[PDB]
């Protein structure tokens, strides 16, 4: 009933806004299910101790700032490193393209936010092979309904685990 | 339906001889047993003799002196009781029971008396 | 002549069922990473099928090849009671496996709070108690007076004991298994849509089809022939529908550990 999550992503992406206004610790609870999030910080920057943080974790919650472009290739290379092999295998990634309201002001609203998701999905469709999924979401700081999305994505992860167990897929 | 009607019994002196018969008025399958049981007034039914396709069984108190036989064409079973001791005074029934299914047809009964 | 032939194919089935059901138990008794309630629901099914294939079924094979019962009457009573008990416990183990899989694919996150380590133990207790209540039915009250010949071993076929136990031992678990597995099938189609319905349909189809193909002939011949006097079947068809229910306990280790990837990694490791 206690699911461990692994928060990751680049800095200035609203991870604290995800944590507060919804290696450090976080605990929250949706529908009497308790989630336990290990905030590593900047991936390949500091506090990258995967010995206990990635030990039987349920999912990795990558956070991307969808307003800046000078560090978007850095986040793309970060997701390419984490998704393919960073000692985190068969661990599904719940991607949060954060700060969606900070994109429409700088940019008709369909092609403004789907290309950015398409690059992360192009990276996620190179080493999947049915081992683990990727769940991308368009989130913003004025949207505190992200816990429902984390709940439903972990529900689908464990449902696919039970389907793979009982030989139904 | 099969209605076993037995006969042949009567009044025998001690050490005498009797020949019980049991008819069928029907058809018993060859994969069914057919036996003779005995109940004294006061005690319960005990097995006495039985003949089927797989074995021929006796009770250990009548083992040497009783003889069961079967005619499957006339569907009858005989019990030749020789050297009748004065404890066989009872009612003898014939049965047409199965080996492995709860199917048992039962006869009417025949009084057999040994005295001395 | 044919007694040795039928006896050696029967004993081959006995050794296959015993070896399979001891391999299912050895896959958990040595691999300590299998410790959940889902694995115990397969362990008790293997325990019931191992008790049937070890303690009951050699005497069934001897009774079939000899033609008569060569042991006592108390051994016949014990053998018939343990026969009904182990077959009923096997069917109810299949039923509780089906219920566990339904509330495992319908509530994936809320599964350790709805199937705890205490409610699964109580479900095992309540299926084994009901199997023992059905099997010690004719041992005091539910029995017409059997013949006193020691070389017969007649099963109880009372109309009212056959109907009640047939209902509460096959036809309620059949309806439960059908409902839970049809809902599992509906979930498994993502509630490539051709490669998903085919695999789940085949996987659940062999699971429900082996169960119905082994047990529905027996539980359709037994209450119908005990109630309608016109339908009296042959004596070869009764032995066939009797031994198909025995065949289910040898079929079960091929199905249910091979419907689990941890059991598929442990089964080929222990053999
Ligand atoms: C087709 C028939 C013959 C068999 C069907 C299976 C039953 C033997 C199972 C299925 C549902 C089970 C029940 C499901 C839930 C529970 C948990 C538990 O419930 C409680 O009251 C415990 C306290 C709580 O839950 O808060 C006790 C056992 C019980 C009733 C189980 C008893 C055994 C049951 C009836
Ligand atoms: C003999 C028997 C009788 C009944 C009733 C119907 C008479 C109660 C049963 O439910 C069960 C399970 C059995 C055991 C058995 N059947 C096929 C193989 N082994």
């Amino acid at each position: 009933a206690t699911h461990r999550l692994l928060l990751l992503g680049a800095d200035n992406s609203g991870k604290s806004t995800i944590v507060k206004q919804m290696i450090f610790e976080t605990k929250f609870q949706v529908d009497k299910v308790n989630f336990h999030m290990f905030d590593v910080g900047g991936q390949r920057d500091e506090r990258r101790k995967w010995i206990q943080c990635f030990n039987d974790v349920t999912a990795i919650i990558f956070v991307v700032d969808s307003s800046d472009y000078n560090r978007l290739q850095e986040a793309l290379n970060d997701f390419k490193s984490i998704w393919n092999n960073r000692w985190l295998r068969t661990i599904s990634v719940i991607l949060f393209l954060n700060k969606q309201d900070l994109l429409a002001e700088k940019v008709r609203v369909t092609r403004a936010k789907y290309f950015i998701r398409d690059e992360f999905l192009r990276i996620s469709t190179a080493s999947g092979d049915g081992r683990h999924y990727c769940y991308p979401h368009f989130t913003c700081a004025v949207d505190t309904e992200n816990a429902r999305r984390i709940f439903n994505d972990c529900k689908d992860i464990i449902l696919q685990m039970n389907l793979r167990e009982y030989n139904l897929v | 339906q099969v209605q076993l009607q037995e006969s042949g019994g009567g009044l025998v002196q001690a050490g005498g001889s009797l020949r019980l018969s049991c008819a069928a008025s029907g058809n018993i399958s060859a994969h069914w047993k057919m036996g003779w049981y005995r109940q004294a007034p006061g005690k319960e039914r005990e097995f006495v003799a039985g003949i089927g396709y797989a074995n021929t069984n006796y009770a250990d108190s009548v083992k040497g002196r009783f003889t069961i036989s079967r005619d499957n064409a006339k569907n009858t079973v005989y019990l030749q009781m020789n050297s009748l001791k004065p404890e066989d005074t009872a009612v003898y029934y014939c049965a047409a029971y199965s080996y492995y299914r709860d199917h048992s047809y039962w006869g009417q009964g025949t009084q057999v008396t040994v005295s001395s | 002549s044919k007694a040795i032939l039928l006896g050696v194919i029967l004993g081959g089935l006995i050794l296959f069922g015993v070896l399979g059901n001891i391999l299912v138990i050895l896959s958990v008794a040595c691999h300590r990473h299998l410790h959940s309630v889902t694995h115990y629901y397969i362990v008790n099914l293997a325990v019931a099928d191992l008790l049937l294939t070890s303690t009951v079924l050699p005497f069934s094979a001897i009774f079939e090849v000899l033609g008569y019962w060569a042991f006592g009457r108390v051994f016949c009573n014990i053998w018939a009671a343990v026969d009904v008990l182990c077959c009923t416990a096997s069917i109810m183990g299949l039923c509780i496996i089906s219920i566990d899989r339904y509330i495992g694919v319908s509530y994936p996150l809320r599964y350790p709070t709805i199937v705890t380590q205490r409610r699964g133990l109580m479900a095992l207790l309540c299926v084994w108690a009901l199997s023992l209540v059905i099997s010690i039915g004719p041992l005091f009250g539910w029995r017409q007076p059997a013949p006193e010949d020691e070389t017969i071993c007649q099963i109880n076929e009372e109309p009212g004991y056959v109907l009640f136990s047939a209902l509460g031992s096959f036809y309620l678990p059949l309806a439960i298994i059908l409902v839970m597995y049809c809902r599992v099938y509906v979930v498994a189609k993502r509630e490539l849509k051709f490669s998903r319905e085919k695999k789940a349909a085949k996987t659940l189809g062999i699971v429900v089809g082996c169960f119905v193909l082994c047990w529905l002939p027996f539980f359709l011949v037994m209450p119908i022939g005990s109630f309608f006097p016109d339908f009296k079947p042959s004596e070869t068809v009764f032995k066939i529908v009797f031994w198909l229910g025995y065949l289910n306990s040898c079929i079960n280790p091929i199905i249910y550990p091979c419907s689990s990837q941890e059991f598929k990694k442990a089964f080929q490791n222990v053999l």
Side-chain angles (χ1 to χ4, degrees), chain C residues 219-229 231-241:
Chain C
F219 279 106
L220 197 148
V221 158
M222 190 54 60
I224 289 313
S226 291
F227 267 125
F228 305 137
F231 171 70
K232 179 50 91 206
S234 177
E235 274 324 293
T236 317
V237 290
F238 170 72
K239 304 271 205 87
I240 286 158
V241 309

Side-chain angles (χ1 to χ4, degrees), chain B residues 33 37 45 47 53-55 57 97-104 106, chain C residues 63 67 143-144 147-149 151-155 157 232 235 238-239:
Chain B
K33 220 176 167 159
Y37 295 15
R45 262 210 274 103
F47 169 79
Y53 69 103
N55 63 327
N57 195 15
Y97 50 95
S98 164
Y99 280 96
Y100 53 92
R101 284 173 59 84
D102 192 73
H103 296 153
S104 300
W106 284 94
Chain C
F63 195 22
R143 196 63 179 90
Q144 67 107 38
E148 285 94 22
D149 185 22
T151 66
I152 68 179
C153 194
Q154 289 188 345
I155 59 179
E157 282 171 36
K232 179 50 91 206
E235 274 324 293
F238 170 72
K239 304 271 205 87

Side-chain angles (χ1 to χ4, degrees), chain C residues 173-191 195-224:
Chain C
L174 183 63
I176 290 162
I177 278 159
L178 263 61
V179 163
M180 308 269 98
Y181 277 153
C182 91
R183 283 178 206 256
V184 160
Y185 170 72
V186 165
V187 170
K189 308 178 314 208
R190 308 309 196 262
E191 81 277 18
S195 162
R196 283 197 267 98
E197 307 201 1
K198 265 199 303 205
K199 163 90 166 158
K202 168 169 286 187
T203 301
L204 296 185
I206 68 175
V207 161
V208 308
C210 286
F211 172 57
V212 303
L213 190 64
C214 290
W215 275 118
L216 181 56
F218 178 76
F219 279 106
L220 197 148
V221 158
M222 190 54 60
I224 289 313

